[PDB]
Design a protein around this nucleic acid. Structure first.
Ligand SMILES: [Mg+2]
Ligand SMILES: [Mg+2]
Ligand SMILES: [Mg+2]
Ligand SMILES: [Mg+2]
Ligand SMILES: [Mg+2]
Ligand SMILES: [Mg+2]
Ligand SMILES: [Mg+2]
Ligand SMILES: [Mg+2]
Ligand SMILES: [Mg+2]
Ligand SMILES: [Mg+2]
Ligand SMILES: [Mg+2]
Lengths: 58, 240
RNA sequence: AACGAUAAAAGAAGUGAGAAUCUUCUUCGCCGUAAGGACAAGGGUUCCUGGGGAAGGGUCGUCCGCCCAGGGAAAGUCGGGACCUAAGGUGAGGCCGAACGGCGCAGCCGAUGGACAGCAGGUCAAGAUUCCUGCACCGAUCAUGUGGAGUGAUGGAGGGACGCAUUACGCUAUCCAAUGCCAAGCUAUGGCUAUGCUGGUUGGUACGCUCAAGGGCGAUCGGGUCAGAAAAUCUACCGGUCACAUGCCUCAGACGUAUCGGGAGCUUCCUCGGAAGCGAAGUUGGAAACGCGACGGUGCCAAGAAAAGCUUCUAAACGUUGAAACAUGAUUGCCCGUACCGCAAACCGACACAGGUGUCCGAGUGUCAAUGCACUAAGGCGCGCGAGAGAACCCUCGUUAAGGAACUUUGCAAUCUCACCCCGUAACUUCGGAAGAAGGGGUCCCCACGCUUCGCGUGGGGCGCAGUGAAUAGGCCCAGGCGACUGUUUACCAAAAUCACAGCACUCUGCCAACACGAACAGUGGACGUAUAGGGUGUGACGCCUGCCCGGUGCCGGAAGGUCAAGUGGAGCGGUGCAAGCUGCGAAAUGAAGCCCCGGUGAACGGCUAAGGUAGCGAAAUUCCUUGUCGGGUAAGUUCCGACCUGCACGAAAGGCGUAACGAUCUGGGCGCUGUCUCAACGAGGGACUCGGUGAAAUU
RNA sequence: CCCCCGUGACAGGGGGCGGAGGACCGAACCGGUGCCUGCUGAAACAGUCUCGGAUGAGUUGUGUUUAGGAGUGAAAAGCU
RNA sequence: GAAACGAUGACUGAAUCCGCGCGGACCACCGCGCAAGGCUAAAUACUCCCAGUGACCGAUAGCGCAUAGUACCGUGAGGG
RNA sequence: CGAGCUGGAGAUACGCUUUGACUCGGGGAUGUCCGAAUGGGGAAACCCACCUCGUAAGAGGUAUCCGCAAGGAUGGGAACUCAGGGAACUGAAACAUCUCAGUACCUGAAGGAGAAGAAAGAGAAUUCGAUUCCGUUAGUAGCGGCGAGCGAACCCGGAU
């Protein structure tokens, strides 16, 4: 059939214990010095399109 | 070559394969032949041309009767294009002339012989087939059939002078299979190649044979197959 | 884990709640004898338009072949039926059968075939040989005229009516070239200024004293009835009379004139995009069919549907005072199919699946040719997850020092070889072959000169490491085993040394043939055959050959006798009744095929007791011992070759021995070449790894 | 088939021309040799490459016939 | 089986009322019956349908179906 | 029957109805095309005809099997009935007669039922008086590789 296969149902503890590293990491947010709405570091502020001056439209 | 019937291939009877093998072949048209000749008694005909007929092992001649009507007749060994032939009791013991056995002298070599005065020819129709006239008995005549059987045939039955044509089936070597295919199916399939299930010979561990039997039941070499029949009495000396 | 081919994609613009994915634009890359286009089958509305956005879509969707609504499909001439017949089906009567049912002459059903009248353009969002415009043709009923007497079947005959290969002449479709014509413009990077560049370059019909290959044809009088059931003026058979080349009849197509059509583009309006109006040129030359002229020519054996329409005839029958045939105008025009996909995401494969699917068309350049191969037109696609990374390991690849089979079950795998031309070419042979044997040289460009080109030959010069410069593209040889040979087979582990084979034999069968299917005295296959034919079995081209043994088995042959069934035949025994009777069982002898018995038969089962192996082969596809023994080849040889004979256990049509040629067979050897190996390395791609989206399975 | 030479017991040998073949090479087409890949596949039998036939015992559509101890079979107990 | 009687596919083949069959080889007797012509209600079997009832079921039960021979699988019959 | 109706359908609109709708009970008249199917053909539901009457629309007929003709049969039925034909698994701890069983199945005819039925009978009393069904007789008598196993009938009691 399917050459290598599992030997027992992996317990609720053991199965969950594995997901101990699946913990999503929330973005490190900074507020734009202009338009004042959050933005990700080293990127352009979504709201105005500023990044010292204005680059992107709307 | 002139106004004939359509021959249709068929090797299975009312549905099932009856006569084993038989299958390929270039397609043929049936030529209507005058075997009896009886109604053309007294009237002479001229040999228009000898011809090819793939239905027979012998060649065929074309007769043009004095009344107009043409008939395909069997071609005898010797008959030339443009030779006169007549039917009826009043006829020469010369090539092609059709006459009954009483008027046929002793020793005269004939072919295309009936069995009942009527119906038509039923003996010596193949190539080079000859009937020896041994002698007269009563209203019957003793004759030697191509095989060597001495049948009592009534002197009232018609015949044609001479032996049949199409030389000899010898320089006819076939050659390679396919020749036999452009006629009838893969031939003689060995029952020894078969299986216990298929044919008595079949089985074993190599090449063999042990009892000597045909497809279905019987026994193949030497075993008289004739019945204890009526026609036996109208026949003297069989073998070969 | 996967997201279904390694044919890419990129950016810009738009839309939208939301966009890698939908739209438009410009690039890119992929197919192009297809991955374009046209049918058929099959599917069924999937086609178009306008909406939608649960589910379906291997991701996302604003999108679709999906959900909804509306529409679209037009025929006297295309396919089919009102026409015809094949295989087959069916079949009043007729033949068989426990039944139900099985057969069957005529007839009837049945396209896969025969027959048959329409072309060219235009154009919905979606149909077009159907609608529309232009100009045709077909039959039918009648109307006016012509003509002035036949018309001619349910029957005759003629005719339709037929293969395969090879091929001459002319031709178009159709394709190429140009300082031919026509149209638009411009070009600049260095140049060109047009003799450059790009595009187009004739389709339908009518008429002609125009060119024309090829193709098709004999006419008439008479006689015999004995032939077409009969008739016939028709057809056939025989005869007489003008039949060589000529001569009639046909023009495939080409040309000219006209006319309708189209035609590169051009012109306005534009409602984000279409619509209406206009319209230039038409040349010279080369190629060219599987289409046409056409039922041509020749060669061949394996000897190549039928029926109707159709053309010719009389029988009947109506009428000669209104014939058929012609001509022109009116009229007439039935039923079904027709959208759409259709080598595929709409069909069969459970899937939007790397498979399968019959027919047609399928351009250009280069290339002996070509539907091959590389690029490419028209046209159609990038294959419905994506983005980074550049580990192990996996697949699919490229190169590799020296070595070159040492790998290994085995050169398995992969190299090498590769086309066309020229030279050259063995053993052996069945005289054909082996043979592309082997081996060698060439091959690009330019100029001159020679010829038969689409090019080729000679001479001289140039360039590169290299000239079939890329793609398609045999490695070869020595010996053996088996089978002759082409072929065939285990759909899905066996392609072979199996089966078939031409050739050989033994044998059975006399025709309502043996033999086979079958309820059957049916019917049929064998066969519309007839022993130079048909069945069965074995062997297996060809060459030389096929020994001995008939006791057992089987087949064929004999009868002097033994055996042996029902039945004929009743001697004798017994039951009951007073009795005549009525009753149970009943020998002898006679009574067929078989079996015992005698004889033969081996290309019958067989044997090497009935006899003990004739050649020929032999350690073999057969051999235990065994890696027999000596020789060969190797540095070394359980295999291979060759002798030998001690054949555990070869041997003559379960054929013996040998054989040229054949082989995706099997074994052994050599040359070549090589990552098969010493012994691995580096490089590419696709997974593997990482993010975002969708998210299985055995197992437990 | 037409021309050319040769007579030892000989056969044909040469040219022309023709256009044979279960002939060759090779696409379509029909097939399935060897390896690898695939092996909860793209796929209930395939893929790339390589290989066999390729005017014949050839391939193929449509229509129709033969079936369960029955059919069919260039013969494996194959296919139905 | 000592196998009567019915039945009849094959060959045969009679008596006619001091006549014929029967009574479990066969005989005598004793006893029961008139074949070889037809017709014939009712009591019995069943439940597609109908009505009534039930120590019958109540949605994995009960019909397969709270309705469906449908969806779906199969060329098909068939299955569901 | 006596006020509602306009089917499930929950759906709006037009309406109909005490001159008695609707629904219920009972007759009729229509009834396309297929289907025994029946003019002929056919891949059911579609093709193609002819004869008659008819102004076209339209109406009727054209199959065979019996008998003069009236008139009768063709096909369809859940099970039940009878007739022609007639398995195996299984039991016999194997299997062959036997069993399963004249069961399953196929076929023909038929009806509301059928079949059977008026003693050349049952039978042992010189008793009975057409048939079917139930009880019983009775696992008796008997059959039987006398093995597995199969198994009556008269009498009597009823339904009729
Ligand atoms: Mg027939
Ligand atoms: Mg990736
Ligand atoms: Mg990083
Ligand atoms: Mg040898
Ligand atoms: Mg071979
Ligand atoms: Mg081969
Ligand atoms: Mg992920
Ligand atoms: Mg090749
Ligand atoms: Mg080859
Ligand atoms: Mg519940
Ligand atoms: Mg139901």
């Amino acid at each position: 059939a399917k050459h290598p296969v599992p030997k027992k149902k992996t317990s609720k503890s053991k199965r969950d214990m594995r997901r101990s590293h699946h913990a999503l990491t929330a973005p490190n947010l900074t507020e734009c010095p202009q338009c004042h709405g959050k933005k990700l570091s080293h990127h352009i502020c979504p709201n105005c399109g500023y990044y010292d001056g204005r680059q992107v439209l709307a | 070559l002139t106004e004939a019937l359509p021959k249709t291939g068929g090797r299975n009877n009312r549905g099932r394969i009856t006569s084993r093998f038989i299958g390929g072949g270039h397609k043929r048209l049936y030529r209507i032949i005058d075997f009896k000749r009886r109604d053309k008694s007294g009237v002479n005909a001229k040999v228009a041309a000898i011809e090819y007929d793939p239905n027979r092992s012998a060649r065929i001649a074309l007769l043009h009767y004095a009344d107009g009507e043409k008939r395909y007749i069997l071609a005898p060994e010797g008959l030339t294009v443009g030779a006169t032939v007549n039917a009826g009791p009043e006829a020469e013991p010369k090539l092609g002339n059709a006459l009954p056995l009483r008027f046929v002298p002793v020793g005269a070599v004939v072919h295309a012989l009936e069995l009942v005065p009527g119906k038509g020819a039923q003996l010596a129709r193949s190539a080079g087939t000859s009937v020896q006239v041994q002698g007269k008995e009563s209203d019957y005549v003793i004759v030697r059939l191509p095989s060597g059987e001495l049948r009592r045939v009534h002197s009232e039955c018609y015949a044609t002078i001479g032996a049949v044509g199409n030389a000899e089936h010898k320089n006819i070597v076939l050659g390679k299979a396919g020749r036999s295919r452009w006629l009838g199916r893969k031939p003689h399939q060995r029952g020894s190649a078969m299986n216990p299930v298929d044919h008595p010979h079949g089985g074993g561990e190599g090449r063999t044979g042990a009892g000597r039997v045909p497809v279905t039941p019987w026994g193949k070499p030497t075993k008289g197959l004739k019945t204890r029949r009526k026609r036996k009495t109208s026949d003297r000396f069989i073998v070969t």
